[PDB]
Amino acid sequence: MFAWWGRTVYQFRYIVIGVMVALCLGGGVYGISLGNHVTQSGFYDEGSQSVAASLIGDEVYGRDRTSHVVAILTPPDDKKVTDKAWQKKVTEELDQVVKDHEDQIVGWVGWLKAPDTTDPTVSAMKTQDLRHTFISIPLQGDDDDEILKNYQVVEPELQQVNGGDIRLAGLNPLASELTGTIGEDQKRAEVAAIPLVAVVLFFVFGTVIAAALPAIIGGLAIAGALGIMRLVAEFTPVHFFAQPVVTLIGLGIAIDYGLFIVSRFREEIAEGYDTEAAVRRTVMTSGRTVVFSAVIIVASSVPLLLFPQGFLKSITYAIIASVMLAAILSITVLAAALAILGPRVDALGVTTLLKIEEVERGFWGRLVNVVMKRPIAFAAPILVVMVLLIIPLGQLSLGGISEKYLPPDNAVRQSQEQFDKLFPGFRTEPLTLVMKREDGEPITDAQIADMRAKALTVSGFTDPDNDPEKMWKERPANDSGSKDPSVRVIQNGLENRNDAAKKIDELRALQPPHGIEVFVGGTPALEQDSIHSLFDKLPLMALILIVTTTVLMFLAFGSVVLPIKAALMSALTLGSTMGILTWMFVDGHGSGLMNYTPQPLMAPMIGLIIAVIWGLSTDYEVFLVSRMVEARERGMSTAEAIRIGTATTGRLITGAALILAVVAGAFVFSDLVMMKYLAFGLLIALLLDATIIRMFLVPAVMKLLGDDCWWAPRWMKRVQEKLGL
């Protein structure tokens, strides 16, 4: 199979390069418009009670458009908002923007449209010092994605209102900024990472062409994968976060796959094989390794599909498409490229760009020896410290997206915070009690008061007017609502947002009046229901993830102790990185240096980070411990096999780690705190696996079990033998 392709890829090397490059470039052109076909939904559970509550509320009362855009207007030259000349000028400008963009803007409302109003709420849309007043600009659209697109059409003209002295906040200015970080992080991966990957690869290989080929494969992999995701978007919604994942996870593995087979090819040429034989032998050995690595990653990714969140489903499609294409590219276009180049892959050295030994082996061999001489002296301190690194995970907190996902100095975030300071109480995050009478008869005022009294028995809800009778007010109704009298909604915000899980259960435990059912919704309910469904499915997801990888490791090791030992090592790294991440992003250690706000984490990201870290650690352990098994099966001491595996894989694993560190390190500078969390989790797990696990914990522990590492019942080794994966 790999034998046949190794000969075939040589024979049709020109056809292979031409077809594969055209497909990837054609996919890249198709994938340019992906950013215009992604969605922001997917963080919630579509089957939850809170989602049903939101659908009923919107259907009966109408979609609330008053939070789409809020604009703070400050008169120039220290004038007050009561300046009649200033009022007329800004009013005419706003009317012109609405008239020019009626397809996008419903209109604008606020104190400026009725300065002589007596309504206390409308009169509160201006500050006491008369220096600031704000307006609401509802937008057209039937869903949040369409509404955001409408906002981005009119934003440039809106920002010019009042001589530019207008501050835009609310849902869509922030949603535009949050989704805008995707483009900023992506250019880093393609303008800052790839050049740094090139200098890292040049330090590994020493020649220009050998260093350039893995970078080119990564670029082709990104181009094709974005095109595949664009195709996927035609059939199912694709979350916008799936796009940066392609450029982070897909790019890193694509370059690492390229590094592995280019390294093997140069070693085959150096051993004396001609180009034809070298290509075949590289596919037979390194091509099998990358293909098996791909199935490990795919096996580590598909368990996320158990979760209902569309966000997680979109990520796995991106991951699977990225790794399958990269594996295919590494053994089709890369192998064909080396077949054409031959030894000329090393032709160009430092001088080209310039114009435009025994000690090392012994030391690393000695380090393994020192570790094995006193293994408990190494394993015991490492085991203790890694367990202590799990302790901060006990302080795990979970929430949802806000303006705090942006750095504290972000302009749009600061406009939002200025609005909440100048105009307190206008922003709310209420829990809703969606009352429905199954009889179809109208809900009475007494029944609404019965429900309010029940909700007033739950502590922790805000009382701004100090009167409980003014709490749990009815949701405002819009003209787009059906106003079905059999459905009525009352709502109230929480005093402390972290109490949402407890308070929602209390609300859901209240007995409603006789013939009515109650659905509890609101944004805090949407998050808590999504949190609950994720951790409900997590035990099954973790079970499938562990067993699928362990059997794959058993197929790769031919042992029963080795897959179990490596699963324990994977669990230790997974726990340690999560504690460190909680220590950094919840507790805030490192927040000032990296300019992010400590806050609760996003729950679907822990599921993603579990799958990614488990896959990465399994991938590195499989490659290393194999070379030990391969040395043991041919006849060697257990101590020598550990030394041979470490020496023979040291250059490749270290180089792969350096590559991924550059790629992930580029994304730790993202303005989105969620991306920082994912990129750092990758960096920590990589540093632990490449240094603490590979060089200290693996060689030490494996010496403790001695020759029992290779133990495996023969009726199980026969199944491994009959397949030979």
Ligand SMILES: CCCCCCCCCCCCO[C@@H]1O[C@H](CO)[C@@H](O[C@H]2O[C@H](CO)[C@@H](O)[C@H](O)[C@H]2O)[C@H](O)[C@H]1O
């Ligand atoms: C993160 C913060 C973003 C969320 C905050 C956004 C919510 C704040 C927007 C307030 C919108 C509702 O506030 C106000 O309600 C009143 C009461 O019906 C509406 O009703 C008003 O209409 C117009 C004013 O334009 C006049 O005829 C009159 O003063 C009144 O009837 C106003 O048009 C609306 O401005």
Ligand SMILES: CCCCCCCCCCCCO[C@@H]1O[C@H](CO)[C@@H](O[C@H]2O[C@H](CO)[C@@H](O)[C@H](O)[C@H]2O)[C@H](O)[C@H]1O
């Ligand atoms: C690998 C990622 C998972 C790491 C999990 C982090 C757990 C941190 C525990 C903090 C201590 C709080 O202790 C709590 O214990 C209960 C069971 O008693 C578990 O969780 C329980 O409480 C939560 C809190 O509302 C409820 O949704 C529910 O009743 C149940 O899930 C969690 O463990 C933790 O919520």
Ligand SMILES: CCCCCCCCCCCCO[C@@H]1O[C@H](CO)[C@@H](O[C@H]2O[C@H](CO)[C@@H](O)[C@H](O)[C@H]2O)[C@H](O)[C@H]1O
């Ligand atoms: C591959 C191995 C991985 C296997 C991992 C298995 C982990 C299983 C853990 C189940 C218990 C965690 O359960 C989860 O606990 C957290 C606390 O952190 C609760 O979290 C709750 O309290 C926290 C802290 O007050 C709030 O910030 C949060 O909004 C609220 O939901 C979750 O509601 C509950 O669902």
Ligand SMILES: CCCCCCCCCCCCO[C@@H]1O[C@H](CO)[C@@H](O[C@H]2O[C@H](CO)[C@@H](O)[C@H](O)[C@H]2O)[C@H](O)[C@H]1O
């Ligand atoms: C990636 C996309 C994520 C972008 C999200 C970033 C967060 C942006 C900040 C939120 C700003 C809007 O803040 C918004 O305030 C309004 C008005 O108080 C709340 O609106 C709430 O009260 C109003 C008026 O009583 C009800 O008609 C409505 O049904 C209810 O939801 C919204 O629930 C909240 O979302």
Ligand SMILES: CCCCCCCCCCCCO[C@@H]1O[C@H](CO)[C@@H](O[C@H]2O[C@H](CO)[C@@H](O)[C@H](O)[C@H]2O)[C@H](O)[C@H]1O
């Ligand atoms: C036969 C006796 C007389 C017939 C009754 C006619 C009404 C008499 C009661 C008027 C005062 C009731 O007192 C006040 O009622 C209003 C309107 O219902 C309630 O108002 C509350 O419920 C109503 C719906 O019922 C919501 O639309 C509103 O947003 C919410 O605040 C107040 O919470 C209550 O304090």
Ligand SMILES: CCCCCCCCCCCCO[C@@H]1O[C@H](CO)[C@@H](O[C@H]2O[C@H](CO)[C@@H](O)[C@H](O)[C@H]2O)[C@H](O)[C@H]1O
């Ligand atoms: C800088 C931080 C970046 C983020 C984290 C990256 C983690 C990478 C750390 C790698 C640690 C050093 O890891 C060590 O690398 C050396 C040199 O490559 C390998 O050594 C390998 O190459 C050397 C020559 O260079 C040979 O003599 C040796 O026989 C061979 O094994 C070791 O087998 C490995 O144990």
Ligand SMILES: Cc1cc(C)c2cc(C(=O)NC3CCCCCC3)[nH]c2c1
């Ligand atoms: C889930 C996941 C995520 C990432 C970023 C990576 C990176 C690798 C990797 O670098 N693997 C290499 C070493 C294993 C042997 C074959 C050569 C490739 N695996 C990953 C898995």
